[PDB]
Symmetry: C2
Subunit: 268 residues, 2 copies
């Protein structure tokens, strides 16, 4: 029950306050929709938890957490625009919650807003934030166009988890060395997270690109699944190995909980 955590409540509060700032009725309505997805605000919470691990506090990290969530939301909106109305042009138009123009502009608005929110954190944090945004765009380009698959997961998904953790560390007073270790934890979790998502997606196709599909180009179906799940366990193990090197406290305990919650628990 992450919705019960103080960290979750703080992020939700920041999100709501953020929404009150939107003047354009249309944009406000769209943003309210993307935030009302029932998600668990994993990325921003990870950022606050890391700040807590490093400093025992997270008050000052709220805007960085919101910036990361805004970037995530912008990517979801743009990806929806891509998948629903920009790639299969000769086929029947797919349904879309927001109009195409609305989806594009709402995403641009959110990215710009994330810049305003990340603005007080300094050069290192802001440069990392920018680099993650670039990785995400490049990742999507690859996504629509073995090695490339994993380069894709890293760029499109792992990257944001990595900076949610490193920025959290930086906002909690961490030096480059420590922030780097958190980056590794984030990359590990994010990778396991995406593979899990791809496994579930692969199974949906079976019911009527993903890792299992990639492996089937040379091996059995189940074997492809077995190696995919082994890939998840490998990265989950890598994530926990790193987490174990950090200060023992409730925030660290929560990071362990999140790790299982979004990876192996989804494979039950």
């Amino acid at each position: 029950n992450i919705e019960e955590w103080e960290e979750y409540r703080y992020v939700e509060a920041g999100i709501k306050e953020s929404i009150t700032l939107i003047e354009d009725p249309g944009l406000k309505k769209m943003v309210e929709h993307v935030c009302h997805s029932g998600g668990k605000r994993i990325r921003p919470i990870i950022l606050l938890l890391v700040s807590e691990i490093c400093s025992g506090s997270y008050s000052r990290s709220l805007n960085a957490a919101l910036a990361v969530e805004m970037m995530h939301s912008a990517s979801l909106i743009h990806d929806d625009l891509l998948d629903q109305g920009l790639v299969r042009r000769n086929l029947p138009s797919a349904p879309e919650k927001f109009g195409p123009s609305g989806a594009l502009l709402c995403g641009d608005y959110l990215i710009a807003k994330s810049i305003a929110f990340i603005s007080p954190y300094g050069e290192k944090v802001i440069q990392d934030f920018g680099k993650a945004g670039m990785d995400m765009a490049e990742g999507e380009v690859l996504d629509l166009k073995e090695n490339d698959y994993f380069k894709c997961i890293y760029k499109k998904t792992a990257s944001l988890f990595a900076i949610s953790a490193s920025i959290g560390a930086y906002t909690g007073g961490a030096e480059e060395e420590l922030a780097e270790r958190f980056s590794h934890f984030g990359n590990a979790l994010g990778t396991a997270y995406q593979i899990v998502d791809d496994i579930l997606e692969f199974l949906e196709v079976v019911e009527g690109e993903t890792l299992p599909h990639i492996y089937m180009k040379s091996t059995s179906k189940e074997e492809a699944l077995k190696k995919s799940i082994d890939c998840v366990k490998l990265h989950v193990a890598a994530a926990k190995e790193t987490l174990e090197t950090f200060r023992e406290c409730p925030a660290r305990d929560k990071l362990f909980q999140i790790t299982d919650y979004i990876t192996v628990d989804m494979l039950e």
Copy 2:
């Protein structure tokens, strides 16, 4: 001949170096295309010139200038995507240099890249940069949906000119008070600039929304044009009035040249 200015050459050098950093062949090719538009790099040059006025130097301002140009390019690409394939869905598909997916992702890539380039300039500059990005998205939303027309020009176009000048001032050691005066110059120039563009566009429609069209809802064609041009002269005058309060030097002379070059000179 702005192409002969040291400021122009420095920006061009930065742009070229920036291009060498792009790993994805496709993205690199797209960026090369948007930069190879024959434009005069007005916004980034204004930023460098302002830094010169305030400090006598502009070396340290290159990345801020590039960030502003990247934001401009991203907006042009996204606007092309909007106008060409997201608004007139029931009509024949309009031709596009980049595929729809490519245009969207290239724009997102450039915005993120601008974040990485603006990263070392501090909270005030980065917050202003973010706010301009937001104004631009909101401006486009209004653009496609009297007071609204001018709110549109301010948000979509004047805003970027305003921060190109204010950020230039900040990078040149200016305090809030001085940077604000430059912001006013930029807003003035940007407004005159857009109205001029709208007047030329209006005349193209006459040959076979814009200010002249807006006025015609209650007055004659020529009268609508007369009041539109008077609007240009008003803002050009406002821009020069402000410029005259700044330190007399070659950079200031160049700002006067640019002011006429992109406004009244285009009306001959």
